[PDB]
Enzyme design. Sequence first.
Site, mmCIF file in Angstrom:
data_model
loop_
_atom_site.group_PDB
_atom_site.id
_atom_site.type_symbol
_atom_site.label_atom_id
_atom_site.label_comp_id
_atom_site.label_asym_id
_atom_site.label_seq_id
_atom_site.Cartn_x
_atom_site.Cartn_y
_atom_site.Cartn_z
ATOM 1 C CG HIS A 76 36.742 40.862 41.041
ATOM 2 N ND1 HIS A 76 35.971 39.895 42.197
ATOM 3 C CD2 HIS A 76 38.533 41.084 42.030
ATOM 4 C CE1 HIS A 76 36.843 39.630 43.393
ATOM 5 N NE2 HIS A 76 37.989 40.475 42.912
ATOM 6 C CG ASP A 100 32.973 39.566 40.630
ATOM 7 O OD1 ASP A 100 33.439 38.577 41.674
ATOM 8 O OD2 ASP A 100 33.595 39.650 39.512
ATOM 9 N N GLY A 156 43.803 38.235 46.965
ATOM 10 C CA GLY A 156 44.150 37.180 46.565
ATOM 11 C C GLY A 156 43.992 35.599 46.920
ATOM 12 C CB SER A 158 38.368 36.573 45.105
ATOM 13 O OG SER A 158 39.224 37.236 44.044
HETATM 14 C C1 XSV Z 1 32.764 45.030 35.800
HETATM 15 O O1 XSV Z 1 32.905 43.861 36.228
HETATM 16 C C2 XSV Z 1 33.438 44.332 37.793
HETATM 17 C C3 XSV Z 1 34.744 44.568 38.086
HETATM 18 C C4 XSV Z 1 34.721 44.622 39.448
HETATM 19 C C5 XSV Z 1 34.070 43.965 40.845
HETATM 20 N N1 XSV Z 1 35.229 44.503 42.368
HETATM 21 C C6 XSV Z 1 34.146 43.287 42.681
HETATM 22 O O2 XSV Z 1 34.215 44.097 44.094
HETATM 23 C C7 XSV Z 1 36.327 44.808 44.020
HETATM 24 C C8 XSV Z 1 37.030 43.468 44.361
HETATM 25 C C9 XSV Z 1 36.257 42.148 45.426
HETATM 26 C C10 XSV Z 1 37.526 41.308 46.448
HETATM 27 O O3 XSV Z 1 38.815 41.605 47.105
HETATM 28 N N2 XSV Z 1 37.529 40.028 46.292
HETATM 29 C C11 XSV Z 1 38.244 39.181 47.034
HETATM 30 C C12 XSV Z 1 39.561 39.114 46.073
HETATM 31 O O4 XSV Z 1 41.048 38.561 46.954
HETATM 32 N N3 XSV Z 1 40.527 39.741 45.243
HETATM 33 S S1 XSV Z 1 41.450 39.667 44.494
HETATM 34 O O5 XSV Z 1 42.173 38.477 44.374
HETATM 35 O O6 XSV Z 1 43.033 40.278 45.828
HETATM 36 C C13 XSV Z 1 41.732 40.405 43.203
HETATM 37 C C14 XSV Z 1 41.182 42.008 43.465
HETATM 38 C C15 XSV Z 1 42.785 40.247 42.305
HETATM 39 C C16 XSV Z 1 41.081 39.804 42.283
HETATM 40 C C17 XSV Z 1 38.331 38.099 47.524
HETATM 41 C C18 XSV Z 1 38.478 39.402 48.408
HETATM 42 C C19 XSV Z 1 39.140 39.408 49.871
HETATM 43 C C20 XSV Z 1 40.108 40.269 50.718
HETATM 44 C C21 XSV Z 1 39.161 41.945 49.968
HETATM 45 C C22 XSV Z 1 40.350 43.479 50.208
HETATM 46 C C23 XSV Z 1 39.591 44.924 50.393
HETATM 47 C C24 XSV Z 1 37.886 44.641 49.438
HETATM 48 C C25 XSV Z 1 36.871 44.945 49.924
HETATM 49 C C26 XSV Z 1 36.420 43.818 48.900
HETATM 50 N N4 XSV Z 1 34.634 44.208 49.307
HETATM 51 C C27 XSV Z 1 33.005 44.040 49.064
HETATM 52 O O7 XSV Z 1 32.958 44.828 47.728
HETATM 53 O O8 XSV Z 1 32.343 44.264 49.956
HETATM 54 C C28 XSV Z 1 30.659 44.159 49.370
HETATM 55 C C29 XSV Z 1 30.235 43.382 48.868
HETATM 56 F F1 XSV Z 1 30.457 42.914 47.508
HETATM 57 F F2 XSV Z 1 30.706 41.916 49.460
HETATM 58 F F3 XSV Z 1 28.954 42.816 48.976
HETATM 59 C C30 XSV Z 1 30.400 44.378 51.221
HETATM 60 C C31 XSV Z 1 29.984 45.834 50.075
HETATM 61 C C32 XSV Z 1 30.672 45.701 49.108
HETATM 62 C C33 XSV Z 1 36.119 43.313 47.918
HETATM 63 O O9 XSV Z 1 36.080 42.142 48.812
HETATM 64 N N5 XSV Z 1 35.877 43.332 46.537
HETATM 65 C C34 XSV Z 1 36.312 45.268 45.732
HETATM 66 C C35 XSV Z 1 32.962 42.953 42.769
HETATM 67 C C36 XSV Z 1 31.991 41.911 43.895
HETATM 68 F F4 XSV Z 1 33.137 40.662 44.296
HETATM 69 F F5 XSV Z 1 32.326 42.712 45.401
HETATM 70 F F6 XSV Z 1 31.511 40.927 43.923
HETATM 71 N N6 XSV Z 1 32.538 42.648 41.087
HETATM 72 C C37 XSV Z 1 33.188 43.505 40.232
HETATM 73 C C38 XSV Z 1 32.604 42.880 38.825
#
Ligand code: XSV
Length: 198
Positions: A76, A100, A156, A158
């Site tokens: 992501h 992911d 930020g 992840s």
């Molecule tokens: C097509 O391919 C794909 C496309 C899109 C995808 N978008 C995915 O998730 C998105 C991004 C990820 C995230 O924010 N990561 C961190 C980060 O820092 N990102 S980042 O570095 O800033 C940045 C964005 C620059 C890179 C450390 C978090 C720190 C703070 C959180 C901010 C609030 C967000 C809360 C959310 N919470 C959640 O979803 O919790 C649940 C869980 F996922 F745990 F089950 C519980 C029910 C859902 C969450 O954390 N994220 C939402 C996932 C994943 F990650 F979900 F696998 N796969 C994908 C595969």
Amino acid sequence: HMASMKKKGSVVIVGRINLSGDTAYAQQTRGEEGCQETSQTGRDKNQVEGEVQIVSTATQTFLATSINGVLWTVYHGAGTRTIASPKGPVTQMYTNVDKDLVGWQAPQGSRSLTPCTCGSSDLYLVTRHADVIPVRRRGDSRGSLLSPRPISYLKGSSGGPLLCPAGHAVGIFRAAVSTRGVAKAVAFIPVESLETTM
Ligand SMILES: COc1ccc2nc(O[C@@H]3C[C@H]4C(=O)N[C@]5(C(=O)NS(=O)(=O)C6(C)CC6)C[C@H]5/C=C\CCCCC[C@H](NC(=O)OC5(C(F)(F)F)CCC5)C(=O)N4C3)c(C(F)(F)F)nc2c1
Ligand SMILES: [Zn+2]
């Protein structure tokens, strides 16, 4: 139309989390202008050090962690992008959207963490701000923060590592579990999943 189709830039290492001494601290190794140019060319002449890199695209910044000779991060953040290196863009060695997870060959000069075999549940999350956060393992891919905090503090990070007490890699930080903006738990990619991929 075809002649104007653009190419996405490379992921660029812009800093690192220094864990080599008694104090964890973030270091920046490239500023924004250099990052943008390096993303377009894919050529990064900077010397790389350490286990946890701070990485960026034109649109996102996050972390990457070297484990057994592979620099790992989240899909992501990186998508299918190359990473910049001294020799030009480097294609991903691993891509798994279902986990992911992506990985490239670890950069020359990096140091790799060793996969944990301790079977311990007392973990430590390393953030892009070099905070070392105790996390109790609660499942194969989940852990609870001993001290919850706003998701702003985890944004930020992840791609960063969860470590065991002995400093082995236990997993890769993936997502924050938030209740009204407060992270009480984290989701991570277990290191065993990385080891199967390899
Ligand atoms: C097509 O391919 C794909 C496309 C899109 C995808 N978008 C995915 O998730 C998105 C991004 C990820 C995230 O924010 N990561 C961190 C980060 O820092 N990102 S980042 O570095 O800033 C940045 C964005 C620059 C890179 C450390 C978090 C720190 C703070 C959180 C901010 C609030 C967000 C809360 C959310 N919470 C959640 O979803 O919790 C649940 C869980 F996922 F745990 F089950 C519980 C029910 C859902 C969450 O954390 N994220 C939402 C996932 C994943 F990650 F979900 F696998 N796969 C994908 C595969
Ligand atoms: Zn261990």
